[PDB]
Amino acid sequence: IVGGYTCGANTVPYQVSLNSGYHFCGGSLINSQWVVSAAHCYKSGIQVRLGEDNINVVEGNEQFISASKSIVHPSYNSNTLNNDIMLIKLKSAASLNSRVASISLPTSCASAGTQCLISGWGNTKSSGTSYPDVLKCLKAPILSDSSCKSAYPGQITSNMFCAGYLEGGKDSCQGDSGGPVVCSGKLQGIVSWGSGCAQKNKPGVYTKVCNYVSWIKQTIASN
Ligand SMILES: COc1cccc(CN)c1
Numbered sequence: 001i002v003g004g005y006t007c008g009a010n011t012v013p014y015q016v017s018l019n020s021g022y023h024f025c026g027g028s029l030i031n032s033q034w035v036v037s038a039a040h041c042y043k044s045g046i047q048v049r050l051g052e053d054n055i056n057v058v059e060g061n062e063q064f065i066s067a068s069k070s071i072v073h074p075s076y077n078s079n080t081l082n083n084d085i086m087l088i089k090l091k092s093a094a095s096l097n098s099r100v101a102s103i104s105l106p107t108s109c110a111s112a113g114t115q116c117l118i119s120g121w122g123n124t125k126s127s128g129t130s131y132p133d134v135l136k137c138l139k140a141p142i143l144s145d146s147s148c149k150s151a152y153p154g155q156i157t158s159n160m161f162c163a164g165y166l167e168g169g170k171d172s173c174q175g176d177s178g179g180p181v182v183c184s185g186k187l188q189g190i191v192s193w194g195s196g197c198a199q200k201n202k203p204g205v206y207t208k209v210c211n212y213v214s215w216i217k218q219t220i221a222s223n
């Protein structure tokens, strides 16, 4: 997260870190046994880390649970990043509490201008590289479909939305991938793509979760 703030430990209880020997992506806990992430975050050997603030230190609220299965969306296209969503099932159910908690799926899609919270452990520089140990947060509005399409001609599908600031300076970044965009207590987005971080006229692009609720529910009910 570029241009954000330190969230504060365990203030984003659905936020998870996906670890394959190191943090590589974020995710969102949506029930005791399942995580939503980006399809581009797919790899084998994933351990889900919940209850994290400083990802380099054991601080006492963590649960580390290996994934038993990953399910990438059937329609994910890695080139276009259309349908950039994946589910990850935990080997064991997480113990839910104030600091480890699920986030509700959307019942409605959020509109442009809605204010959301985007979070992650990704790079904090628009030009350099600095990775924070503690969770970073950004408050950002959903952008209009027209402005998003104008920003990225030819690339925005009905399964994507833009959020952020056309002026630059505040954005998601590498390693934030897969993480949450939450608006009014519901997971409306997944950190997906962009062109660099925090550049003018290149806001972040997010998977449009409301489009996937039926798939998510059905998949969970049978797996
Ligand atoms: C270029 O790498 C990125 C990864 C996640 C999100 C974004 C959006 N600025 C960019």
Ligand SMILES: [Ca+2]
Pocket: 052, 053, 054, 055, 056, 057, 058, 059, 062
């Ligand atoms: Ca930790």
